[PDB]
Amino acid sequence: PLPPGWEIRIESGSGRIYYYNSITKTTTWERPRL
Numbered sequence: 001p002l003p004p005g006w007e008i009r010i011e012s013g014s015g016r017i018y019y020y021n022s023i024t025k026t027t028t029w030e031r032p033r034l
Contacts, residue, residue: 001032
């Protein structure tokens with residue numbers, strides 16, 4: 001998803017950007033798979 005809880009981080013490997021949710025402490029390698 002993309003609520004005001006995710007933060008923009010890029011993942012080193014494939015080169016895609018992913019998001020970091022500091023609220024629930026959830027993070028995911030290149031983009032959110034949900």
